[PDB]
Design a protein around this ligand. Structure first.
Ligand code: L8C
Ligand code: K
Ligand code: K
Ligand code: ZN
Length: 640
């Protein structure tokens, strides 16, 4: 399977600029490209990507998305002087032309096609194109908002034609609406377009009625256009994550795309003068991370906007860091989305309830200057994953996993058995030595990121893992338990949150436990994913653990969702996760190690519908927990 990350960039795309006074376009400058590539170099990220050369898009490639009349017109701009270039530009809204912009527009588009080919040919796993001019405002016969040709639209149309793809997802996280992409695919159910964007009740450029949440697509495309308008500025990390957990991700995992393309404008970041939002550069590590289990990791990230040179470089690095599989930064201070964002989210979920199973329960009453801290260092672990199979069993491990007891650790095991345990089963005592050794190599280390240990006795293993973690000290521990019965886990001090997926319906009592009893049958997969995206991840992100403890008891239908969970759960605690598997199951063990190690997750297939019984259970959990954990909210709360 595919390995690295493509980086596509050429200096030539910085060789056009604005040649006259125009306050509407002053902000789009060649330095955006130079600063972003130079920040990737500074952080050692460009050196770790496969450089793929740019090329020109061909005439027939441009005609996939644009009219002969418009291409013929743009083709004449290289021969124009400044007066003619100014006259030509004024025919369009917020765009300038330059003798070299037609050349550069061909390169930005070809650069995007190069990335698609590298990913679809399995030459790389994923990649990013750093291009100018941007694309997503560009239309069939018009330049618009700095865009000449619609780079990302090309990518989807090209991938449809040349790879016979039937489902492509486009995520536009630029702060502006990509109306050029919306128009291109508005009737096409094979391309799912998602956009959030500063809107302010249509007072913000481009000032379009059809940028609102009620534009869902047309004809056979109904439901495959998703607009989330931001009606106030200052949106934060919590607003962006709420948008992902409660709108985009549920639909994207149900759609099950074969390719993901990101219209990656970083004018949605803190400090940007166009966006005026407040999200930290670190959030793009998580927006990237949360999408990577789709389409077997096949993701093409295409630069659009972003005008604060500092804000821009940091966000580009956080994105490539994530494409490279480096550990995600911890996001602190998360909570409820603001009221305007909850209104936008609840309105889009309601209008989309006719088209997506994650929202269908909503349709019937029966079912209800600017500064900020520099991002910290993200170093990939020497060995990413450590595994301790049962004694004897050697396994075929990925190149970045490794088998594991020191004299010091042996003394600690004896101390613990002497005070707290009596037990002499010499292998469930080797268990404890392995748990303590692997945890020490996770926390007080830097060399290892996560690990998986097979165990016999859950209660002493869990207790030893949990207690050793707490005194390390890891401030908070998220525990994810698949199984029944009660663990030696205390949730009465705030330092532990326990998620439990079980078979017997348990009444929860306090707001530090989430207990999900999902029914038996075919819909267990969709129900689990709905719970993961809409309940588990919101709470876990708000909790912000320093360690994730996963626990599976011996008794297998979740063996189809476990990979997605352990991939997504690595967005917490910088990927520091210890998974305890009770008993040897080679498939589950190999899958756990696969996902812990950063390998691609196999797709689920287009998702069925969850049972209404399960959706009712999940929304009762949300109602019970969302006052404590506001990131769970996907509606505006009632005022007194
Ligand atoms: C406040 N207004 C808003 C719009 N603006 C023109 C404009 C700027 C940036 C983009 C873009 O595409 N950014 O990524 C598009 C149009 C002029 C003043
Ligand atoms: K957008
Ligand atoms: K569409
Ligand atoms: Zn933009």
């Amino acid at each position: 399977a595919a390995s690295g990350s493509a980086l596509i960039f050429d200096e030539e795309m910085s060789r056009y600029k604005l040649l006259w006074t125009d306050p509407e376009c002053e902000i789009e400058v060649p330095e955006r490209l130079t600063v972003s590539y130079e920040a990737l170099r500074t952080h050692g990220l460009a050196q770790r990507c496969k450089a793929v050369p740019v090329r020109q898009a061909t005439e027939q490639e441009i005609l996939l998305a644009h009219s002969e009349e418009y291409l013929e017109a743009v083709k004449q701009t290289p021969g124009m002087n400044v007066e003619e270039l100014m006259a030509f530009s004024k025919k369009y809204n917020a765009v300038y032309f330059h003798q070299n912009i037609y050349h550069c527009a061909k390169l930005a588009a070809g650069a995007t096609l190069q990335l698609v080919d590298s990913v679809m040919k399995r030459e790389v796993r994923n990649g990013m194109a750093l291009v100018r001019p941007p694309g997503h405002h560009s239309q069939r016969s018009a330049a618009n908002g700095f865009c000449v040709f619609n780079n990302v639209a090309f990518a989807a149309l090209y991938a449809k034609k040349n790879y016979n793809l039937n489902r492509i997802l486009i995520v536009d996280w630029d702060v502006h609406h990509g109306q050029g992409i919306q128009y291109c695919f508005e009737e096409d159910p094979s391309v799912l377009y998602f956009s959030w964007h500063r809107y302010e009740h249509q007072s913000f450029w481009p000032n379009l009625p059809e940028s609102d949440y009620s534009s869902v697509g047309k004809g056979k495309g109904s439901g495959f256009n998703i607009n989330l308008p931001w009606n106030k500025v200052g949106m934060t990390n919590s607003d962006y994550l709420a948008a992902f957990f409660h709108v985009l991700l549920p639909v994207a995992y149900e759609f099950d795309p074969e390719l993901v393309i990101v219209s990656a404008g970083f004018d949605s970041a803190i400090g940007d003068p166009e966006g005026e939002m407040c999200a930290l550069p670190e959030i793009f590590a998580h927006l990237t991370h949360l999408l990577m289990p789709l389409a077997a990791g096949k993701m093409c990230v295409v630069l659009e906007g972003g005008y604060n040179l500092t804000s821009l470089g940091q966000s580009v690095c956080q994105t490539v860091h994530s494409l490279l599989g480096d550990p995600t930064p911890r996001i602190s201070g998360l909570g409820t989305a603001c009221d305007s964002a909850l209104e936008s989210i609840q309105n889009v979920r309601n209008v989309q309830s006719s088209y997506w199973s994650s929202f269908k329960h909503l349709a019937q009453s029966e079912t209800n200057d600017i500064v900020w801290p520099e991002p910290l260092k993200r170093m990939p672990a020497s060995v990413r994953t450590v595994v301790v199979p049962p004694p004897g069993v050697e396994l075929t491990l990925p190149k970045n996993c490794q088998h594991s007891i020191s004299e010091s650790t042996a003394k600690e095991v004896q101390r613990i058995r002497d005070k707290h345990f009596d037990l002499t089963d010499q292998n469930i005592l080797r268990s404890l030595g392995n748990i303590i050794s692997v945890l020490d190599r996770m926390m007080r280390s830097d060399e290892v990121c996560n690990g998986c240990v097979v165990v016999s006795d859950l209660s002493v293993s869990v207790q030893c893992a949990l207690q050793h973690a707490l005194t390390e000290p890891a401030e908070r521990v998220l525990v994810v338990y698949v199984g029944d019965g009660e663990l030696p886990v205390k949730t009465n001090d705030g330092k532990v949150f326990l998620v439990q997926i079980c078979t017997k319906e348990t009444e929860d009592k306090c707001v530090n436990r989430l207990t999900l009893c999902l029914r038996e049958g075919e819909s267990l997969t969709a129900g689990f994913m709905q719970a993961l995206l809409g309940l588990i991840l919101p709470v876990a992100y708000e909790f912000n653990p320093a360690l994730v403890l996963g626990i599976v008891e011996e008794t297998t239908r979740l063996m189809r969702v476990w990979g997605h969970m352990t991939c997504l759960i690595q967005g917490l605690a910088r990927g520091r996760m210890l998974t305890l598997l009770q008993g040897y199951d080679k498939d589950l063990l190999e899958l756990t190690v696969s996902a812990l190690s950063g390998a691609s997750i196999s797709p689920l297939g287009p998702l069925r519908a969850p049972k209404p019984e399960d959706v009712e259970m999940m929304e009762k959990q949300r109602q019970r927990l969302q006052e404590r954990w506001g990131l769970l909210r996907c509606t505006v709360s009632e005022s007194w």
